[PDB]
Amino acid sequence: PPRPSSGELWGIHLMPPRILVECLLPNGMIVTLECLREATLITIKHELFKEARKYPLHQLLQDESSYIFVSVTQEAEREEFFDETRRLCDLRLFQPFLKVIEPVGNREEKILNREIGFAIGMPVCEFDMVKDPEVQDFRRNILNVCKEAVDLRDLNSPHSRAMYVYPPNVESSPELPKHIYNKLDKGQIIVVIWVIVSPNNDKQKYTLKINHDCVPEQVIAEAIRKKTRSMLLSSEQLKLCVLEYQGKYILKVCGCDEYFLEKYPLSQYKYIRSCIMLGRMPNLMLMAKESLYSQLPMDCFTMPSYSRETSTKSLWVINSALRIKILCATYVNVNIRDKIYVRTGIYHGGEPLCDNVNTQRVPCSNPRWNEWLNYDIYIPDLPRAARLCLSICSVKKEEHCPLAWGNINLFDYTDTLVSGKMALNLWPVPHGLEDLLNPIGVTGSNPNKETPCLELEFDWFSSVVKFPDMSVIEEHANWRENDKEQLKAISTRDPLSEITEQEKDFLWSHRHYCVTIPEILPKLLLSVKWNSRDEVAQMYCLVKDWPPIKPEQAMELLDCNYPDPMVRGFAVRCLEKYLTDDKLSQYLIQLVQVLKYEQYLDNLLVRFLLKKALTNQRIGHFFFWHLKSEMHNKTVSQRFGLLLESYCRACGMYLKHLNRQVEAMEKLINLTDILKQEKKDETQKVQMKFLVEQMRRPDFMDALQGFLSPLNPAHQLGNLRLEECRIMSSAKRPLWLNWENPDIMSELLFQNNEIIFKNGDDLRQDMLTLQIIRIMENIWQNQGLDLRMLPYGCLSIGDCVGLIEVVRNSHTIMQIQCKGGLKGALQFNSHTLHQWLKDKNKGEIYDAAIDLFTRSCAGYCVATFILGIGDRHNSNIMVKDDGQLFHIDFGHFLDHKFGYKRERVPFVLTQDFLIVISKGAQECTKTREFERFQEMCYKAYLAIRQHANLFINLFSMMLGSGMPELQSFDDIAYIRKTLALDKTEQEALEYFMKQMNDARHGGWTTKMDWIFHTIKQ
Amino acid sequence: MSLQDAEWYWGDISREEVNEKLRDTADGTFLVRDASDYTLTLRKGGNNKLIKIFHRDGKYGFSDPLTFSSVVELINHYRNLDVKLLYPVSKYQQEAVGKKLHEYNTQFQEKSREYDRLYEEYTRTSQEIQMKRTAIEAFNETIKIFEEQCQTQERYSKEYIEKFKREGNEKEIQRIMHNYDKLKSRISEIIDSRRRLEEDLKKQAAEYREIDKRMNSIKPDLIQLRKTRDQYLMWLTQK
Ligand SMILES: Cc1ccccc1[C@@H]1NC(=O)c2cc(NC3COC3)cc(NC(=O)c3csc4ccccc34)c21
Ligand SMILES: Cc1cc([C@@H](C)Nc2ccccc2C(=O)O)c2oc(N3CCC(C)(C)CC3)c(C)c(=O)c2c1
Ligand SMILES: Cc1nc(NC(=O)N2CCC[C@H]2C(N)=O)sc1-c1csc(C(C)(C)C)n1
């Protein structure tokens, strides 16, 4: 089983500097050797065989090379330590002992399984023991997707492999927003190509002026032209030098691992477009194709060893109502301070298909029922996604209460219907669940067998029952004017808008015309009774012959409102065709969480994502971490573990890079665990003294130097600048970590890579927030609205563990006000923020710096309001030295939030920002600089309102994840108030202006208080 | 049939305080609402359905042909597969008194805290039980290795002991036996340690259930105290 902590021994976080290891020699002798904590196995084995000569039967000892060490890990597996570089502390031992054996069997397979097992967080041997045939089928079958993807990787042998590792980071469309085309000089951009002349790295410049829509090969041609121009060549020779050397080189972003491999226009690449809008000069490095391909390993894909007349009727035949016997339950923990009963119900996802029947109330101490339950539903009327939800409950009719629950799929993954006796282990009811049934909870039996086990018997028929194939469904399915005004009005309604019985029947009646409006499919599917084969079969034929829709609209058909596989398969088929790899990376947070809803392990969605992950390493990288971060959860453990196994077995050589990341995080988790536990009541000095001493140790320096940042694996983390590393003030004990950038030309980009490792707080909320903020910025930018947001990187790697990208040269408003500028000591007042900004942007820099603030502030001001993250204070708002505003630490706000107040929200920092937007000016309440700022917010607020459906669907998909602020749709409904979707388009803007005016005037009056944020007013 | 009487007529309250007013109910429990106008809430098929009533021409009706001209005489027709409505949800059910229910909210908090303290020691025990289960499996795999070591000792040492015997070097066999005893003594220490952990496992698994018992005893009270901290509207700030 996955080990609980990241300690070195079971129970002990850190080995003492000297450990007594009981070594089991291969002659049968046990000798106790005092090993150093950081000693490698090579040194331990060497000093062992020297001490072993003192003990009997030492003449039998062969050469040290002919033996390997074996021990038991904290996972309780027998790990054969083939890699003898690994240190004693990094072995994850249960108890300190080592066994000297001679290797048996296949060395390669042994290594790969431990590499995969370490990447997942659980050994592969556990999957081999799972007898569940669905699990073993998924494991065997899913390798088809792995081989398909590997064949595409090795299709264009050298180049396609480089595209896999270094996919072109580009925007979805080459079209340039109106304000971005204006920034470049009449259709062309200035670009600098660099060349490394010798191994003793020095550089040569080649400043070019190129059309923005040039392809990387054309950019190289212009660099060659500039060099060959200065040399004695004829027009034909200059022409030939370009032709014959265009395709021998390759471009790369100076200071990170981002390559221009594909023939996209240069402006479509994100680095260049970012350079264009910011006004920075792109610096690209000239590289040889023969140099990049030399670093590509050429990894192989080898199949593992787990890839090795019955009477049957159809379901469209059997005539009877659903009947289920509740045999007996093993035990129920009750106090005899209260009789108990079993409540059941047949559900189609969230919606129940029929009435919920109960069992007879039986004594508290005797748990037996043995009664055929008769549900109010017809068996052939069942859909494909029909499933049983039941639970054991108790009564004080006076006071009902559930104890243990459990859901089952009424149909197997084979399309077989349940038949006969079945034992089901139940799950415990979550902390915040008062419902008698838990219908949307995870489907299946509890792996933990030491829980209440309720047994039941299903109706056995003559033969084996199976759901009919689609061809049989088409047979049963076989059997105007102008009402187009309503269909096009409810199609543009947000998904959280109510659909009345008038409109549901009106949609079902006019469904054959709805094909002409394909975006109304989500509304139409809700307007169907899923307990009627008549209607279900007619929808099935419509779905298959349904026009493809936008991928943003198709993503809605994968949340908890559409459990039908034909509905999901359509959405996956839409994604397979139309969704770009860019938008895939954008919406990966939702797409991974959506996997949880799918009934079975093997399905169309996992096969789509896994192939794309095995085809694009930037997708696969975050696909890995998003899955691994949910391995702590038992409810998802099995599926995500099996899916991670599929990726790790096929991803290739990046598996080793991921292991280096895992090992690096494991070190950080354990180090923080010590600071949070054990060394809890120690001062900052002592813990920093411990940090410096412990980080300096060779096991830590080796583990956390020379690996790729999980926040962005294009950024390489070199050596630690330990002088900068420190523990942050927060009681959760975060780790500030600084790294040298080992890129050959880090000078021209990231000089320092700084990351915040925090162990304690849940970062899932920040991830989703920063994602939506990024999407909001994208929508504004494509509409020619320049509002510069800063969605800094954030990635959760486990249960309340993750990383945070550090923004350089940024300070909180609180930090800004601490300086003073030699105006006393700490004394400040509103104007100081502006004075600080002017004192650090002088000259003509000032004018552009003020512009950056207003644009960035307007974006966040609008965004925060729509989302409810507006009531922020000096500590949670940051300003860069150039003058870019951005809010931080969104999870802290969500943790600190009945339903009757909020009618008035005073923003005290309105006054401080108005002085920044408009220089000085005693009466800055209304200026020309302010009138511009307001219009920017108006344009933005309405722009998000136009794309409101996207954000609603984005949150709706994030309901599978167990977030306390995202459980029901009532939580998401808040956006409808801020955006005012029911109100008129013009009225919504009039509403917005009122909300802002109230917050402004409220800020003037209120007295803030600096530390505790308590308003005296 | 009046504009407002307070029998099955609330305002245009949200869809959050509607589903929760007929959740786990029979084919009834209905109330009146408004829409983006009139709205009627229904329940049939085990589901929560919603119907709109167009009030144009100063008249009412569900189906296409307009068949009424008042609000409360539209219910009476369908009241007695358009299934009937059964029982309505009242507006009169549990002298300037918001202070006695201050004792039910004090109880709610005093039941939330005690339940949260129990849920804390439920998760803490649940984790520690799973920890001990794996630790036994590690001890078991450890013993299997140490027993496979004894076989390797008896296998290799035979030819050397069956040679020091034919030589009289007794205090050389003693060295071999002294080590084999150390190996066997360590196995007994591991087995004795694993047996003690099995005692701590089942003694905690019993205490684990006692926590679950008290939680299942307290849980019904918390769910019913949720209804008894109800608030009246339009009155600002209360403790
Ligand atoms: C769920 C949601 C979606 C969209 C908008 C609002 C909500 C929440 N529902 C509400 O009723 C509510 C109220 C406030 N604040 C009160 C106003 O006066 C104080 C804020 C929030 N925000 C979030 O919870 C939220 C924002 S981004 C993110 C990422 C992950 C988890 C949650 C969040 C919401
Ligand atoms: C200059 C400035 C002005 C405002 C508001 C008070 N003013 C306007 C804003 C837009 C258009 C017109 C006005 C106007 O009143 O003329 C800001 O509001 C917020 N919040 C978002 C809205 C909340 C109600 C949640 C308060 C927090 C933040 C974070 C700011 O940075 C901000 C900055
Ligand atoms: C993105 C981000 N960037 C930061 N940058 C800095 O802190 N600095 C820049 C150089 C000076 C130094 C300073 N101001 O002391 S903090 C942060 C951030 C975002 S959420 C967060 C919590 C750890 C508080 C949750 N932190």
The CATH number assigned to the domain holding A334 equals: 2.60.40.150
Structure tokens at A697: 């140790």
Token look-up 């429990």 returns B29
Residue to substitute in A910, A933, A998 for testing ligand 2 pocket (most ligand atoms within 8 angstroms of CB): A910
Range of the domain at B109: 98-239
Does A385 lie in the same domain as A258? Answer: no
Are A366 and B191 a contacting pair, CB within 8 Å?
A: no
Of the candidates B51, B133, B179, the beta carbon closest to that of A501 is on B51
**What DSSP character marks residue A359?**
P
Residue A155 falls inside a structural domain: no
**Which atom, in ligand 1's list, is nearest to the CA of A868?**
20
Q: Is residue A854 domain-shared with residue A932, that is, in the same domain?
A: yes
Position A870 in a domain: yes
State how far the alpha carbon of A766 is from the alpha carbons of A708, A754, A849, A888, B138, in Å: 22, 18, 27, 9, 38
- Nearest CB among B16, B142, B157 relative to A28 is that of B157
Contact B141 A982 (CB under 8 A): no
Does residue A518 fall inside a structural domain?
yes
Q: Judge if the beta carbon of residue A994 lies within 6 A of ligand 3.
A: no
Cα(A887)–Cα(A871) distance, integer angstroms: 11
**A563 exposure class (CB count in 10 Å sphere: 0-12, 13-18, 19+):** buried
Residues B205 and B112 in one domain: yes
| Residue A268: inside a domain | yes
B99 contacts: CB under 8 Å, gap ≥ 6: none
Give A923-944 as a DSSP string.
Answer: --SS-HHHHHHHHHHHHHHHHH
Chain A residues whose CB is inside 8 A of the B217 CB are 334-335, 337-338
Rounded to 5 degrees, φ, ψ at A406 are -175, 130
Distance from CA of B91 to the nearest CA of A (A): 21
Question: Domain check: are A376 and A492 in the same one?
Answer: no
A806 lines ligand 3 (CB under 6 A): yes
Q: What is the rounded distance in angstroms from the CA atom of residue A766 to the CA atom of residue B140?
A: 43
Q: Which domain holds residue A332?
A: 317-417+428-466
Q: Of the candidates A353, A415, A424, which has an alpha carbon nearest to the alpha carbon of residue A391? A: A424
- The answer to whether residues B190 and B85 belong to one domain is no
Rounded Cα distance, B98 and A87, in Å = 67
Shortest Cα–Cα distance, B146 to chain A (Å):
8
CATH of the domain at A495: 1.25.40.70
Quickly tell me which residue has 């290594």 as its tokens. A111
* CB-based contact A183:A279 (threshold 8 Å): yes
The burial class, CB within 10 Å (0-12 / 13-18 / 19+), for A675 is buried
- Whether A445 and A519 share a structural domain: no
Q: Does one domain contain both B116 and B52?
A: no
Give whole-number Cα distances, A222 to A204, A218, A292, in Å: 15, 6, 21
Signed CA dihedral, A96, A102, A104, A107: sign only: positive
Which residue from A596, A575, A599 is spatially nearest to A587, judged by alpha carbons? Answer: A575
Q: Extract the tokens encoding A613.
A: 């992950």
- Which residues, listed in sequence order, are joined to residue A286 by a DSSP beta bridge? A251
Nearest residue in chain B measured CA to CA from A402: B216
Query: For residue A62, what are its two tokens?
Result: 């062969």
Instruction: Find out whether the beta carbon of A876 lies less than 6 Å from any atom of ligand 3.
Output: no
3-state secondary structure of A208: strand
Structurally, chain B folds into a number of domains equal to 2
Angle, alpha carbons A428-A430-A434 (nearest 5°) = 105
| Torsion sign over Cα A249, A253, A258, A261 | negative
Would you say A592 and A627 are in contact if contact means Cβ atoms under 8 Å apart?
yes
Number of domains in chain A: 5
| Same structural domain, B37 and B135 | no
- CA gap B90, B31 in Å, rounded: 8
Rg of the Cα trace of chain B? 37
Any CB–CB contact under 8 A between B83 and chain A? no
Distance of CA A538 to the CA centre of its chain: 37
* d(CA A685, ligand 3 centre) in Å: 21
Residue B221: closest CA among chain A residues belongs to which residue? A399
Write down which residue in B59, B94, B129 finishes a domain.
Answer: B94
Nearest to A159 by CA among A101, A217, A74: A217
In ligand 2, which atom is closest to the CA atom of A1003? 6
Q: How far is CA A442 from the centre of its chain?
A: 20
Cα–Cα distance, A906 to A995 (Å, whole number): 11
Ligand 3 near A771 CB (within 6 A): no
Where do we find the tokens 């990231």? A750
Q: Which of A50, A401, A870 is nearest to B213 (CA)?
A: A401
CB A222 less than 6 A from any atom of ligand 3: no
Residue B239 CB contacts under 8 Å (≥ 6 apart), including other chains: B102
Chain A residues with CB-CB distance to B231 below 8 A: 900
Contact criterion met (CB below 8 Å) for A361 and A375: no
> Can you name the residues that pair with A362 across neighbouring β-strands?
A340
A323: enclosing H helix or E strand: strand A321-329
Question: Is residue A624 within 8 Å of A610, Cβ to Cβ?
Answer: no
Helices (H), ranges, A677-790: 684-695, 698-703, 764-782
User: Measured in angstroms, how far is the CA atom of residue A276 from the centroid of ligand 3?
Assistant: 27
Of A335, A345, A529, the CB nearest to B213: A335
Same domain for B55 and B27, yes or no, is yes
Q: Extract the tokens encoding A191.
A: 């670009």
* CA–CA distance, B73 with B88 (Å, rounded to integer): 15
Method for this entry: X-ray
**Please, which residues bridge with residue A805 across strands?**
A755
C-alpha dihedral (A380, A381, A382, A383), degrees to nearest 10:
110
CB A413 within 8 A of CB A601: yes
Domain boundary at A244, A264, A295, which? Answer: A295
Beta-carbon-side half-sphere exposure of residue A182 (alpha carbons within 13 Å): 6
Q: How far is CA A908 from the centre of its chain?
A: 35
Say whether both A96 and A181 belong to one domain: no
Give yes or no for a contact between A968 and B19, defined as CB atoms under 8 angstroms apart. no
CA angle A519, A521, A526 (to 5 degrees): 140
CA distances from A344 to A372, A395, A429, A433, A437 (A): 12, 15, 15, 16, 7
Probe residue for ligand 1, chosen from A593, A894, A953 as the CB with the greatest number of ligand atoms within 8 Å: A894
Instruction: Give the other-Cβ count within 10 Å of B230's Cβ.
Output: 11
Judgement on whether residues A1000 and A872 belong to the same structural domain of the protein: yes
Same domain flag for B120 and B235: yes
Q: How far, in Å, CA of A564 to CA of A568, rounded? A: 6
> Quick check: is A676 in a domain?
no
User: What's the rounded Cα separation, in Å, for the pair A401 and B225?
Assistant: 13
Cα–Cα distance between A427 and A405 in angstroms, integer?
5
Ligand 3 pocket member A819 (CB < 6 A): no
The amino acid at residue A446 is: N
Matching residue, tokens 């601490």? A818
Tokens of A389: 């939800």
Query: CB-side exposure of A492: number of CA atoms within 13 Å?
Result: 10
Residues A1002, A943 share a domain: yes
Which residues of chain B come before a gap where C and the next N are over 2.5 Å apart? 36, 80, 94
Answer with the one of A536, A564, A592 that is the final residue of a domain: A564
B116 and B72 together in one domain: no
My answer on whether A461 and A474 are in the same domain is no
Angle at B61 between CA B56 and CA B67, to 5 degrees: 105
Is A30 within 8 Å of B39 when comparing Cβ atoms? no
Name the residue with the closest Cα to ligand 2, atom 32.
Answer: A861
Best probe residue, ligand 2, of A773, A813, A861, A905 (max atoms within 8 Å of C-beta): A861
Residue A846, SS3? helix
CA A83 to mean position of chain CA atoms: 32
Computed on alpha carbons and rounded to an integer, the radius of gyration of chain A in Å comes to 32
Tell me which DSSP letter residue A269 carries. Answer: B
For residue A996 and ligand 2, the question of a CB distance below 6 A is answered with yes
Contact (CB, 8 A) for A40 and A83: no
Nearest to A379 by CA among A326, A421, A319: A319
- State whether A813 and A891 are in the same domain: yes
DSSP β-bridge partners for residue A33:
A21
Q: Which two tokens stand for residue A548?
A: 């493809």
Q: For A363, what's the count of Cα atoms within 13 Å in the CB-facing half-sphere?
A: 2
CA distance A302 to A286: 36
- Asked if the structure places residue A799 within a domain, the reply is no
User: Do A398 and A521 have their domain in common?
Assistant: no
Chain A CB within 8 Å of residue B15 CB: yes
Handedness of CA B208, B213, B216, B218 (dihedral sign): negative
CA distance A823 to B9: 65
Residue A400's closest chain B neighbor by CA?
B220
The Cα-based distances of A186 to A180, A181, A265, A284 in angstroms read 11, 8, 16, 22
CA atoms within a 13 Å half-sphere pointing along the CA-CB vector of B238: 19
The atom of ligand 3 lying closest to the CA of A889 is: 20
Classify residue A200: in a domain, yes or no.
Answer: yes
Q: Is residue A871 part of a domain?
A: yes
Angle among Cα B163, B169, B175 to the nearest 5 degrees reads 95
Domain boundary among A451, A466, A481: A466
Asked whether residue B49 falls in the same domain as residue B163, the answer is no
Residues A462 and A530 in one domain: no
CA angle A11, A12, A17 (to 5 degrees): 160
At residue A698, the 3 state secondary structure works out as helix
B2, amino acid identity: S
Q: Please indicate, yes or no, whether residues A1014 and A997 belong to a single structural domain of this protein.
A: yes
**Beta pairing, strands A321-329 & A453-458:** antiparallel
A375 three-class SS:
strand
> From the CA of B136, how many Å to the nearest CA of chain A?
9
Same domain, B171 and B221: yes
Q: For residue A756, which ligand has an atom nearest its CA?
A: 3
Residues contacting residue B159 through CB under 8 Å, at least 6 positions apart? none
| Residue A20 Cα to chain centre, angstroms | 43
